[PDB]
C-alpha cells in the first residue's frame, strides 16, 4: 500500500546526457545515436537573449565551435542543423548506451519524469504534468536547459520535453524534441506570461481512485450525477470538462474498485462545493491533479520496465 509521486527510473536517460558548450554558454544536451540535441540558445551570449536572430547567429558558427563533452571524453562534431528551437549536432561517435526511444508530443494533463541536469550531469529526477496552460511546475536553475522530460514504456524511452526557460511565478516552458514549443512561448528574454491555469479533472478522479484503493474512502458519498451536471459545477471551480474519452480511460480504475465514474464524479462535486473540512486524502490537504489514470494503475499494480 501507499501512494507517492513516483518518477520513472532515470538510468536510460542518464546514459544520454552530455554537456554542450558554445563560446561561454553551457547547457545540457541529449546524445542519441550520433546526434546531440540541445536548446538553440547555446549559440547566444547573454546580450543575444533579448532579441536573438538564431538563423544569423548559427551562420557565423562552424562545427568546431561546438564543444560536446560526454563524461571526460570530447565528441567531435561533424555537422549541425537547426530544427525550430533545438540544435542537432551530428557527432562522429554513436552513443553506445542509446536506448530504444521515440520523440512524442504529449497532450496537456499528461505526466512525465524530468531529469534535471547541469553541465551534462544529473542532479535529480521528479514527476511533472503538462499543465493546461502548456507550462510545467518544475525545478530549474541557471544552466538547466537541455534537461529532458520522458516516459518509459517497457524498454522504450518516449522523450517529450526539453527545458528552455522559466516564466513568472516560477513555472517553466519548453519544447518537444523537434523544437516546437509547448504553448505560445518563444525562446527570447522578453515579457512573457502563461495563461490562467485550470485543474486537470481526469487526473483528480484517478487520484481519488488511488485513495479508494488505499482505503481512504471518507469522501465517497451516496449519490450519482450526469456528465453534464458535473461539468457545469467543474466549470465554476476552474476544472477542465470531463469528456467521454476521459470516462473511458478511467474504466480500469472504475472496474477495479467497483465505483462508476459518474459516482466518483458526484463525490468530487461535493468536495468542490463543501471543501475537505480539515481532512486529507492520501495525506494531501488539497486535491491532486498530476497523476494520470495510467500513473495510478502503474503504481498500484507495480508495472516494471526493462
Ligand X SMILES: *C(=N)[C@H](C[C@@H]1CCNC1=O)NC(=O)[C@@H]1[C@@H]2[C@H](CN1C(=O)[C@@H](NC(=O)C(F)(F)F)C(C)(C)C)C2(C)C
Binding segment toward its own copies, per CB under 8 A, in 10-18, 157-165, 236-244, 245-253: 10-18
Considering the complex, state which of residue 43 and residue 210 has its C-beta at the smaller distance from its own copies: 210
| Nearer CB in complex with its own copies: 191/286 | 286
How far apart (Å, rounded) are the C-alpha atoms in residues 27 and 145?
5
Q: Please state, in angstroms and rounded to a whole number, the distance separating the CA atoms of residues 160 and 247.
A: 25
CA-based nearest residue to 230, from 288, 276, 272, 269: 269
- Tell me, yes or no, if 41 is annotated catalytic: yes
Task: Indicate which of ligand X, its own copies, none lies near residue 41 (CB less than 5 to 8 Å, by partner kind).
Answer: ligand X
Binding to its own copies, residues 216-235 (CB under 8 A): none
Query: Is position 253 an interface residue for its own copies (rule: CB under 8 A)?
Result: no
CA pair distance 174, 65, nearest whole angstrom: 25
Integer Cα distance of 165 and 184 in angstroms: 13
Give the nearer residue to its own copies in terms of CB position, either 57 or 271.
Answer: 271
- Cβ at position 30, least distance to ligand X in Å: 14
Strands across the sheet containing 73-75? 73-75, 66-70, 17-22, 25-32, 35-39, 86-91, 77-83
Q: Which residue's CB is nearer to ligand X, number 24 or number 190?
A: 190
Decide if residue 194 touches its own copies (CB under 8 A). Answer: no
Cell 565551435 belongs to: 65
Q: Does 286 sit near its own copies (CB under 8 A)?
A: yes
The residue from 67, 106, 171, 247 that contacts its own copies (CB under 8 A) is 171
Least gap, CB of 77 to its own copies (angstroms): 23
Among its own copies, ligand X, none, what binds residue 222 when CB lies within 5 to 8 Å by partner kind? none
**Contacts for 34 with CB less than 8 Å, ≥ 6 apart:** 90, 91, 92, 93, 94, 95
3-state secondary structure of 53: coil
Burial class from Cβ neighbours inside 10 Å (0-12, 13-18, 19+) for residue 43 reads buried
306 binds its own copies (CB under 8 A): yes
Binding site for its own copies (CB under 8 A): 1-12, 14-15, 115-119, 121-126, 128, 137-144, 166, 170-172, 214-215, 280, 283-286, 298-306
* Residues designated catalytic: 41, 145
Amino acid at each position: 500500500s501507499g501512494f507517492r509521486k513516483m518518477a520513472f527510473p532515470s538510468g536510460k536517460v542518464e546514459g544520454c546526457m552530455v554537456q554542450v558548450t558554445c563560446g561561454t554558454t553551457t547547457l545540457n544536451g541529449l546524445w542519441l545515436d550520433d546526434v546531440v540535441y540541445c536548446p538553440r540558445h547555446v549559440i547566444c551570449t547573454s546580450e543575444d537573449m533579448l532579441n536573438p536572430n538564431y538563423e544569423d547567429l548559427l551562420i557565423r558558427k562552424s562545427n568546431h565551435n561546438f564543444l560536446v563533452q560526454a563524461g571526460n571524453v570530447q565528441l567531435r562534431v561533424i555537422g549541425h542543423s537547426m530544427q525550430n528551437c533545438v540544435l542537432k549536432l551530428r557527432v562522429d561517435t554513436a552513443n553506445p548506451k542509446t536506448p530504444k526511444y521515440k520523440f512524442v508530443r504529449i497532450q496537456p494533463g499528461q505526466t512525465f519524469s524530468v531529469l534535471a541536469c547541469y553541465n551534462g550531469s544529473p542532479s535529480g529526477v521528479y514527476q511533472c504534468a503538462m499543465r493546461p496552460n502548456f507550462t510545467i511546475k518544475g525545478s530549474f536553475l541557471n544552466g538547466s536547459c537541455g534537461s529532458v522530460g520522458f516516459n518509459i514504456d517497457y524498454d522504450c524511452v518516449s522523450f517529450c520535453y526539453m527545458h528552455h526557460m522559466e516564466l513568472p511565478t516560477g513555472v517553466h516552458a519548453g519544447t518537444d524534441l523537434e523544437g516546437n514549443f509547448y504553448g505560445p512561448f518563444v525562446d527570447r528574454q522578453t515579457a512573457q506570461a502563461a495563461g490562467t491555469d485550470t485543474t486537470i479533472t481526469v487526473n483528480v478522479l484517478a487520484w481519488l481512485y488511488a485513495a479508494v484503493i488505499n482505503g481512504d474512502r471518507w469522501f465517497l458519498n451516496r449519490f450519482t450525477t450526469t456528465l453534464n451536471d458535473f461539468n457545469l459545477v467543474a466549470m465554476k471551480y476552474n476544472y477542465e470538462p470531463l469528456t467521454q474519452d476521459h470516462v473511458d480511460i478511467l474504466g480500469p480504475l472504475s472496474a477495479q474498485t467497483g465505483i462508476a465514474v459518474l459516482d466518483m464524479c458526484a463525490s468530487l462535486k461535493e468536495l468542490l462545493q463543501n471543501g475537505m473540512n480539515g481532512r486529507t486524502i492520501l495525506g494531501s490537504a488539497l486535491l491532486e491533479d498530476e497523476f494520470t489514470p495510467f500513473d495510478v494503475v502503474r503504481q498500484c499494480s507495480g508495472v516494471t520496465f526493462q
